[PDB]
Design a protein around this nucleic acid. Structure first.
Ligand SMILES: [K+]
Ligand SMILES: [K+]
Ligand SMILES: [K+]
Ligand SMILES: [K+]
Ligand SMILES: [K+]
Ligand SMILES: [K+]
Ligand SMILES: [K+]
Ligand SMILES: [K+]
Ligand SMILES: [K+]
Ligand SMILES: [K+]
Ligand SMILES: [K+]
Ligand SMILES: [K+]
Ligand SMILES: [K+]
Ligand SMILES: [K+]
Ligand SMILES: [K+]
Ligand SMILES: [Mg+2]
Ligand SMILES: [Mg+2]
Ligand SMILES: [Mg+2]
Ligand SMILES: [Mg+2]
Ligand SMILES: [Mg+2]
Ligand SMILES: [Mg+2]
Ligand SMILES: [Mg+2]
Ligand SMILES: [Mg+2]
Ligand SMILES: [Mg+2]
Ligand SMILES: [Mg+2]
Ligand SMILES: [Mg+2]
Ligand SMILES: [Mg+2]
Ligand SMILES: [Mg+2]
Ligand SMILES: [Mg+2]
Ligand SMILES: [Mg+2]
Ligand SMILES: [Mg+2]
Ligand SMILES: [Mg+2]
Ligand SMILES: [Mg+2]
Ligand SMILES: [Mg+2]
Ligand SMILES: [Mg+2]
Ligand SMILES: [Mg+2]
Ligand SMILES: [Mg+2]
Ligand SMILES: [Mg+2]
Ligand SMILES: [Mg+2]
Ligand SMILES: [Mg+2]
Ligand SMILES: [Mg+2]
Ligand SMILES: [Mg+2]
Ligand SMILES: [Mg+2]
Ligand SMILES: [Mg+2]
Ligand SMILES: [Mg+2]
Ligand SMILES: [Mg+2]
Ligand SMILES: [Mg+2]
Ligand SMILES: [Mg+2]
Ligand SMILES: [Mg+2]
Ligand SMILES: [Mg+2]
Ligand SMILES: [Mg+2]
Ligand SMILES: [Mg+2]
Lengths: 197, 386, 113
RNA sequence: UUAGUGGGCCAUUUUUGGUAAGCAGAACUGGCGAUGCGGGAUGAACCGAACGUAGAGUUAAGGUGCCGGAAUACACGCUCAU
RNA sequence: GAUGCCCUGACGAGUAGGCAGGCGUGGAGGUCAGUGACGAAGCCUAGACCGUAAGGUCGGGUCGAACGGCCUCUAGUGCAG
RNA sequence: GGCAGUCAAGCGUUCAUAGCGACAUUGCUUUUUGAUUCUUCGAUGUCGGCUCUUCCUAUCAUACCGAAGCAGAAUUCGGUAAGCGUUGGAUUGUUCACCCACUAAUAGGGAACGUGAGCUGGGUUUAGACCGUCGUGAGACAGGUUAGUUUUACCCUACUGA
RNA sequence: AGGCAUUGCCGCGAAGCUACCAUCCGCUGGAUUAUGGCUGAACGCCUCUAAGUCAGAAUCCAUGCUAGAACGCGGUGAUUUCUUUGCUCCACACAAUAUAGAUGGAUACGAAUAAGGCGUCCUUGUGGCGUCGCUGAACCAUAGCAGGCUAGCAACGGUGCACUUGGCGGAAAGGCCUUGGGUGCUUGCUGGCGAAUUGCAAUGUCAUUUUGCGUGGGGAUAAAUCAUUUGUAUACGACUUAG
């Protein structure tokens, strides 16, 4: 419905989110994912580290620059999951992946835009409580990502600015909701209540 | 089947590819960790390799068989005139790494530096920084705002310095320009320091001291296209070998059906960037000093320049650094000296060094005399003297 | 026709690494430009505005010698001659609409006025 | 009346030699060879189904997170694996 | 046009192989009182038409002396190895 | 063939299991050799060594540990571990073997039984020759012996540099 | 004083190249394995393990070191007229261009989920009280020739455009907010006039790029390469120097 959808990666499961994003892009919806460092993977940390090490073992024996390339940043781990669920060697697949952007943290311009979630991929709605899970920032750091602290510093700053914004809107929402309550018990308001408004 | 006898591989896969460095000036790829309690200071310096010579000193190493005995030691002399500061760069941390936010330049740049912005100086109209300098007109609020930017946003500050290559004996007139990181102080203190040194010189004695361990970053001497025997150190094949013997006999198994990146092959040798660590400073020489080759034990008034000049270099009329042993690069090559990235507390690192004698005979043959006077005494009068 | 020739800085003005100085070719082509310029003068064209508007080289019939190879064999050793030709030249410097579209265009102009 | 053929090979079941074999040798049937098509990623032989050229509908075997057409369907349990 | 016309129902995989109906080439008998220096034959042609196909037909360019349709006869009669 | 389990009668002063382990019995491996004959007979160069890279772990050494019939020292059994090393020689074409010696240690293997347009050509394996046995003879011998041409890259890729 | 002897031969021999045959140099953090532990249930005891947790290997990941994506990115300097009036920016036309796909609005807390949001009160708290959820099926916008021309009423609100005021924003800020006046519009309410024939539908053309070209207004006044030259470089290109 929106011409761009900005998904807050936080608290979502890599594969389930990947599967939904992949389908959305193939259907011609532009998507942006933010906070890829807060994304989860089911399974305890150690297991997921072991899986990443198995992946690091894979390389063209006669020349390691010929791939596979082992990207370490959270955003690129998510991009790998996605790229695998799209026919990325076709022109249609290349077009589909041009409709996607993934970021650690929430950079401009997306810091002042609404962020949605994807309930079919939320960890809190999907995992049985008690099952262990990995957070992707921790995983990324353990396999050589270098910017966990920078993103954390920048996110702390953004959240200070954001809390101030919210405090102001929450104040303006009182004035409105107050002025709407005095408008009740007018003829217009009673007429509207008949028609379901 | 398994190789019949084991041996270590030839050469180190951490220094690949063995290609020609991208510039003649090797990049400092890491600066020391900043302690912001300390006063503001350069973390590195630029110089030119003059040559090597020889030193005597007494060894202070308790437990050694050579404790309190004279050793002779090779040294390397780097010609280090003062660097001029001509700008600041502010870098900001990002999730994609450090990015330069803005540069500010000094109002007046010398032709030594201006030359670095041209490939054809003689034909040019010499317009570099002509519009920029006019930013300093009025109060120069344009500059003040750009400095304020750096102070507001930057996480690391580096000064742009240039060598005074005019002060060397080199034929080149175009100076080398490099960013050096300021350690010590707050970001505001760092950008102030830089502002109060625009157009001013910085002397090597400000940066380095006697006994300090330092790192030498330089492009190594070039040797052009080289065979596998000298480039990798592989074993020469037997004299009976048809089709040549300075080779590797087997460049791989049948599978993988590809030559592997780990096999020794012929190609460029030398002109590689290298960072050699832990060179102890044995002397910070003054240029003004007429006795900068003399010691407490050898009171002979003389400079470090050996009789004849340093071969392929010249005199040394400037401040210099004398470093134990050898460093990458050849005579005349730009070299970056850097402060140690760690705090070495070896007994080797902590030794206070005092030179008994510096050799100053000619390096253009089997020099027998330290000075012209020494020669004239031993020889006596010659026919040309009359 | 440049496989395994050498590299040279004089290629840079044309964007290439591979260039050469084929003197025998150059001489033959300059003889033809001289002939074409003369021919243009005889027709009374303006020599200042002449450009090479067509130049074309074609393969002429080979000329055959032989070379002697090891083990008593013989191989060809042929010339690859050319036909060249050139020309210098003086420089010199209904709508179908449906009724619905017609109706729209009319309505559009009735409002604009 | 005349052509080609007179090297076969595979699967289920029965079966001999052999430690066994994608091994050797028989029995009955079905196949491949001579055969595309849907499925089993891929594959002579397996599953479905055998083929003029088209249109519509419905299905087989196999499937329906995404690659990929089709329920991130419904239901009861089980399972956490350095 | 009875080898025609038409009605009805069913069917259509295929190597080796068999048979059938056709297409094409050099030459022969017959015929169209056939085409042609006002352009025969040949050749070129991301121009057109007919045929399931073998193939046939037409336009444009090039060219210069012969050549085709149909009914039959006959073979040194069709190439990717 | 090689390597590993299970059971536990016994051995182990005493005591099944520190270390071992009979009678049995379950497996794994493809560095043995067989079995087979599917691929190649209009040819995939046929032993070994030399050179060089990389991989496996069933670990000889080195790191950190558990066990002991671990007092110490020495050693033995076991774990995580293939990160790092694993040699110089006498005789033999040797692979294998064997001995001397050094060593922290002289572990085992794979990669078309890695690697001949990389070498070498000692062996084998054409044609010359000798011997022994065999054969009436021509001749035979997975028996011994001696002499016996080792070709081509300028293409594509791969790799190394530019 | 020299030639020739395929460098005639011998001794020394600088430079260059070079040798465990020479000299120098070879980093320190984090996370783990085995293992040993802590707290501790299951199982009223016990238990290193189940939840949770400590130490820990030649391991792993960083630090450091080499290359730098020839389709990754940043900062910064100078950007040619003096004559085909070349370059640039802005406004305005006029052409072309071609779209990975506008058709009312991408509508901003953070954190938790065996818990929260909002409001409210006070002893300001891990506080008391109330209320909400059970999906955005929302909220906002939304009437007028694709939206005309006009007359009033009521408010002094809403909203567009250009212009100003002050501020904040460097993660990719290139946007958010704010002052003031101006000028439109107002469907908050009530009037008047227009619309036809696109013929019973036909996207029935309303967006967004990229580039050129012509007008007017501003602005700026270089380099690189070849050739020559160097030897810190080199097969050739390339590199590094000088003019
Ligand atoms: K081998
Ligand atoms: K060449
Ligand atoms: K028959
Ligand atoms: K027969
Ligand atoms: K079939
Ligand atoms: K199939
Ligand atoms: K069926
Ligand atoms: K896929
Ligand atoms: K006829
Ligand atoms: K065989
Ligand atoms: K064969
Ligand atoms: K040894
Ligand atoms: K001989
Ligand atoms: K001579
Ligand atoms: K306890
Ligand atoms: Mg890395
Ligand atoms: Mg070995
Ligand atoms: Mg060396
Ligand atoms: Mg030879
Ligand atoms: Mg010398
Ligand atoms: Mg080539
Ligand atoms: Mg010859
Ligand atoms: Mg001959
Ligand atoms: Mg027959
Ligand atoms: Mg028979
Ligand atoms: Mg037969
Ligand atoms: Mg058989
Ligand atoms: Mg057959
Ligand atoms: Mg399968
Ligand atoms: Mg689908
Ligand atoms: Mg048929
Ligand atoms: Mg004939
Ligand atoms: Mg004709
Ligand atoms: Mg054609
Ligand atoms: Mg004629
Ligand atoms: Mg014939
Ligand atoms: Mg042919
Ligand atoms: Mg054929
Ligand atoms: Mg062949
Ligand atoms: Mg061959
Ligand atoms: Mg071969
Ligand atoms: Mg093991
Ligand atoms: Mg084998
Ligand atoms: Mg082999
Ligand atoms: Mg060979
Ligand atoms: Mg061999
Ligand atoms: Mg070979
Ligand atoms: Mg031989
Ligand atoms: Mg013989
Ligand atoms: Mg060549
Ligand atoms: Mg636990
Ligand atoms: Mg680059």
């Amino acid at each position: 419905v929106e011409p761009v959808v900005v998904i807050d990666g936080k608290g979502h499961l890599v594969g389930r989110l990947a599967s939904v994003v992949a389908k959305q892009l193939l259907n011609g919806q532009k998507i942006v994912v933010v906070r890829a460092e807060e994304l989860n993977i089911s399974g305890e940390f150690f297991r997921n580290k072991l899986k990443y090490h198995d992946f690091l073992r894979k390389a063209t024996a006669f020349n390691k620059t010929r791939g596979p390339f082992h990207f370490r940043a959270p955003s690129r781990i998510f991009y790998k999951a996605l790229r695998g669920m799209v026919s990325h060697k076709t022109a249609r697949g290349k077009a589909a992946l041009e409709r996607l952007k993934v970021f650690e943290g929430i950079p401009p311009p997306y810091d002042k835009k609404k962020r949605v979630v994807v309930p079919q991929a939320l960890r809190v709605l999907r995992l049985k409580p008690g099952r262990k899970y990995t957070t992707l920032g921790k995983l990324s750091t353990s396999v050589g990502w270098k910017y966990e602290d920078v993103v954390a510093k920048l996110e702390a700053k953004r959240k200070v600015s954001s809390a101030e914004y919210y405090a102001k809107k929450r104040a303006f929402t009182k004035k409105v909701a107050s002025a709407n309550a005095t408008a009740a018990e007018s003829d217009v308001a009673k007429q509207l209540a008949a028609l379901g408004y | 089947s398994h190789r019949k006898y084991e041996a270590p591989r030839h050469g180190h896969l951490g220094f690949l590819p063995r290609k020609r460095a991208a510039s003649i000036r090797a990049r400092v790829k890491a600066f020391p960790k900043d302690d912001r309690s300390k006063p503001v200071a350069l973390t590195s310096f630029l110089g030119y390799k003059a040559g090597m010579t020889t030193i005597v000193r007494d060894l202070d190493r308790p437990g050694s068989k050579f404790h309190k005995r004279e050793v002779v030691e090779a040294v390397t002399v780097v010609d280090t005139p003062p660097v001029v500061v001509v700008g600041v760069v502010g870098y900001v941390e990002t999730p994609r790494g450090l990015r330069s936010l803005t540069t500010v330049w000094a109002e007046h740049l010398s032709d030594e530096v201006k030359r670095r912005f041209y490939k054809n100086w003689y034909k040019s109209k010499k317009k570099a920084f002509t519009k920029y300098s006019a930013k300093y007109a009025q109060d120069g609020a344009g500059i003040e705002r750009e400095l304020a930017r750096i102070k507001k946003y930057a996480s690391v500050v580096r000064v742009l310095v240039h060598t005074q290559i005019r002060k060397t004996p080199l034929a080149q007139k175009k100076a080398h320009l490099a960013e050096i990181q300021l350690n010590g102080g707050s970001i505001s203190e760092k950008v102030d320091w830089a502002r109060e040194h625009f157009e001013k010189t910085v002397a090597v004695d400000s940066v380095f001291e006697q006994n300090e361990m330092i790192d030498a970053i330089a492009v190594t001497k070039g040797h052009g296209f080289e065979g596998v025997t000298h480039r990798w150190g592989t074993k020469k094949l037997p004299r009976k070998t048809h089709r040549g013997l300075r080779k590797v006999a087997c460049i791989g198994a049948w599978h993988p059906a590809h030559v592997m990146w780990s096999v020794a092959r012929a190609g460029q040798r030398g002109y590689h960037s290298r960072t050699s660590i832990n060179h102890k400073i044995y002397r910070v020489g003054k240029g003004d000093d007429e006795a900068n080759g003399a010691t407490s034990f050898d009171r002979t008034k003389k400079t470090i320049t050996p009789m004849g000049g340093f071969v392929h270099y010249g005199e040394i009329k400037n401040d210099f650094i004398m470093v134990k042993g050898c460093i990458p690069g050849n005579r005349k090559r730009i070299v970056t000296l850097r402060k140690s990235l760690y705090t070495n507390t070896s007994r080797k690192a902590l030794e206070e060094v005092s030179l008994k004698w510096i050799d100053t005979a000619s390096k253009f043959g089997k020099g027998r005399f330290q000075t012209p006077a020494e020669k004239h005494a031993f020889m006596g009068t010659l026919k040309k003297d009359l | 026709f440049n496989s395994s020739i050498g590299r040279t800085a004089q290629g840079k003005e044309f964007g290439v690494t591979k260039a050469r100085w084929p003197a025998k070719s150059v001489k033959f082509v300059q003889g033809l430009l001289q002939n074409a310029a003369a021919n243009a003068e005889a027709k009374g064209l303006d020599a200042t505005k002449l450009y090479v508007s067509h130049i074309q080289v074609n393969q002429a019939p080979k000329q055959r010698r032989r070379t002697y190879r090891a083990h008593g064999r013989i191989n060809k050793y042929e010339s690859s001659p050319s036909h060249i030709e050139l020309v210098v030249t003086e420089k010199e410097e209904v709508v179908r609409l449906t009724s619905r579209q017609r109706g729209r265009i009319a309505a559009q102009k009735r409002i604009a006025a």
